Amino acid sequence: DIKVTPGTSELVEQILALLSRYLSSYIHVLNKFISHLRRVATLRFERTTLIKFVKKLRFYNDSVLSYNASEFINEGKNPGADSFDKVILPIASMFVKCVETFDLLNYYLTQSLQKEILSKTLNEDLTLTAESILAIDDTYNHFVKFSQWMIESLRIGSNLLDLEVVQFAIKSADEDGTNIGETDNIFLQEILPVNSEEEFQTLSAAWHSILDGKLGALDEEFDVVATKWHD
């Protein structure tokens, strides 16, 4: 198996920092939106629903920011030591719980609430831009894939760590028989197993750059849509 390296504690902190920026970006844009729905009496209860979601994201965030990785990682001599997949298991577990929570929040916010706003307000002052919705999905799909990568590469995969959207894509493709295995769907693309932490750290940095890119683009669309709710 793979044993931990001295830089394991930092690697964990970096990965969690990714999720923290993910959560904070939502908390920032939703607190603006929640504060604006206060003047719209017809959306009084949809406002409280979003508040419940934000509090969950807040808790998810200040739990990530409070977690000290070096506290739950025993190094010793390069043993006796903690296996590397032991320290990653609760990290990927955290990502899964947050990702599925996002899946819930994303649907309500980008589908249900959108249709309810148009029905109640009869205009599009307080709706999300089509640009932002794509940023929501694009960011979600990659945090999903990254979560799957941490799990499958270390072979810590089970039914308890499965993400729904990945499992949906698998069975939907298993039914329609799609196909030769080209494949365009990222959820259907297989994960190569990691043979060393030196390889896990490298590939994590590659994801870290990509996920920050999507997160950066997500921040951009939130700024634009927060402008539309100017007054």
């Binding site: 990659h142 894939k145 990568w149 590469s153 494949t183 990222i186 693309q189 297989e190 994960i191 190569l192 990691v194 590939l203 590659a206 994801w207 990509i210």
Partner: peptide, 8 residues
Amino acid sequence: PVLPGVKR
């Protein structure tokens, strides 16, 4: 779309 550690 080239994701690392992922066989496209």
